[PDB]
Design a protein around this motif. Structure first.
Motif, PDB file in Angstrom:
ATOM      1  N   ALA A 193      -0.082  13.128  -9.206  1.00 44.18           N
ATOM      2  CA  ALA A 193      -0.629  14.479  -9.228  1.00 44.18           C
ATOM      3  C   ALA A 193       0.357  15.435  -9.894  1.00 44.18           C
ATOM      4  O   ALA A 193       1.390  15.000 -10.416  1.00 44.18           O
ATOM      5  N   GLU A 194       0.039  16.737  -9.868  1.00 39.97           N
ATOM      6  CA  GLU A 194       0.846  17.797 -10.477  1.00 39.97           C
ATOM      7  C   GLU A 194       1.250  17.434 -11.904  1.00 39.97           C
ATOM      8  O   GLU A 194       2.424  17.199 -12.201  1.00 39.97           O
ATOM      9  N   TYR A 195       0.257  17.391 -12.792  1.00 36.54           N
ATOM     10  CA  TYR A 195       0.380  16.797 -14.116  1.00 36.54           C
ATOM     11  C   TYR A 195       0.455  17.897 -15.177  1.00 36.54           C
ATOM     12  O   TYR A 195      -0.541  18.587 -15.431  1.00 36.54           O
ATOM     13  N   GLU A 247       0.827  -1.194   0.000  1.00 33.21           N
ATOM     14  CA  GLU A 247       0.000   0.000   0.000  1.00 33.21           C
ATOM     15  C   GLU A 247       0.865   1.249   0.000  1.00 33.21           C
ATOM     16  O   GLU A 247       0.476   2.268  -0.567  1.00 33.21           O
ATOM     17  N   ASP A 248       2.066   1.181   0.580  1.00 34.52           N
ATOM     18  CA  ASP A 248       2.974   2.318   0.500  1.00 34.52           C
ATOM     19  C   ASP A 248       3.502   2.488  -0.915  1.00 34.52           C
ATOM     20  O   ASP A 248       3.722   3.617  -1.374  1.00 34.52           O
ATOM     21  N   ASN A 306       0.759   4.066  -2.674  1.00 35.20           N
ATOM     22  CA  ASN A 306       0.614   5.401  -2.104  1.00 35.20           C
ATOM     23  C   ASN A 306       1.590   6.374  -2.737  1.00 35.20           C
ATOM     24  O   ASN A 306       1.221   7.500  -3.079  1.00 35.20           O
ATOM     25  N   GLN A 307       2.847   5.970  -2.874  1.00 38.90           N
ATOM     26  CA  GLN A 307       3.822   6.855  -3.488  1.00 38.90           C
ATOM     27  C   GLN A 307       3.573   6.970  -4.985  1.00 38.90           C
ATOM     28  O   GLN A 307       3.862   8.008  -5.590  1.00 38.90           O
ATOM     29  N   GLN A 310       0.340   7.081  -6.345  1.00 42.07           N
ATOM     30  CA  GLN A 310      -0.735   8.063  -6.413  1.00 42.07           C
ATOM     31  C   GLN A 310      -0.279   9.447  -5.962  1.00 42.07           C
ATOM     32  O   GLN A 310      -0.784  10.457  -6.463  1.00 42.07           O
ATOM     33  N   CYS A 311       0.676   9.514  -5.032  1.00 41.26           N
ATOM     34  CA  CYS A 311       1.375  10.763  -4.761  1.00 41.26           C
ATOM     35  C   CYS A 311       2.074  11.284  -6.011  1.00 41.26           C
ATOM     36  O   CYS A 311       2.006  12.480  -6.317  1.00 41.26           O
ATOM     37  N   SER A 312       2.755  10.398  -6.740  1.00 39.59           N
ATOM     38  CA  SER A 312       3.496  10.805  -7.929  1.00 39.59           C
ATOM     39  C   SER A 312       2.551  11.328  -9.000  1.00 39.59           C
ATOM     40  O   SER A 312       2.870  12.274  -9.729  1.00 39.59           O
TER      41      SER A 312
END
Lengths: 50, 64
Positions: free
Chosen positions: B57-59, B46-47, B50-51, B53-55
């Motif tokens: 963004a900012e597209y 899940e981490d 998680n990283q 889905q963190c990545s």
């Protein structure tokens, strides 16, 4: 003379080699060794003279 | 060590052919690990995402 040919010393590795012969390719495992032996010749399950 | 013992056994496979032996004597190498293996492997997976889905963004280019 045969003893002099025997490379083996203990119950344990003896039984290992028996285990091995009847189960080639298999690693040494104590419990299975003594289990096998005890099945073959003193277990009433799988040996009978009648 | 099982690879330490697979070493000798494979060195002297008595011309055995059955892949039953091969697969089972391979997968016997790695034992059970659960009850925190389960949850720490879970937290790691899940981490990972998680990283991700963190990545995500900012597209600038993935405009859609």
């Amino acid at each position: 003379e045969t003893l002099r040919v025997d490379p083996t010393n203990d119950r344990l590795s003896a039984l290992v080699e028996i285990y091995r012969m009847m189960r080639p390719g298999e690693p040494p495992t104590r419990e299975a060794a003594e289990s096998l032996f005890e099945n073959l010749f003193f277990s009433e399950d799988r040996y009978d003279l009648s | 060590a099982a690879a330490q013992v697979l070493s000798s056994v494979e060195s002297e496979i008595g011309r055995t052919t059955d892949p039953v032996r091969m697969y089972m004597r391979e997968m016997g190498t790695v034992e059970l690990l659960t009850r925190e293996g389960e949850i720490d492997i879970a937290k790691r997976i899940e981490d990972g995402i998680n990283q991700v889905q963190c990545s995500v963004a900012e597209y600038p280019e993935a405009i859609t």
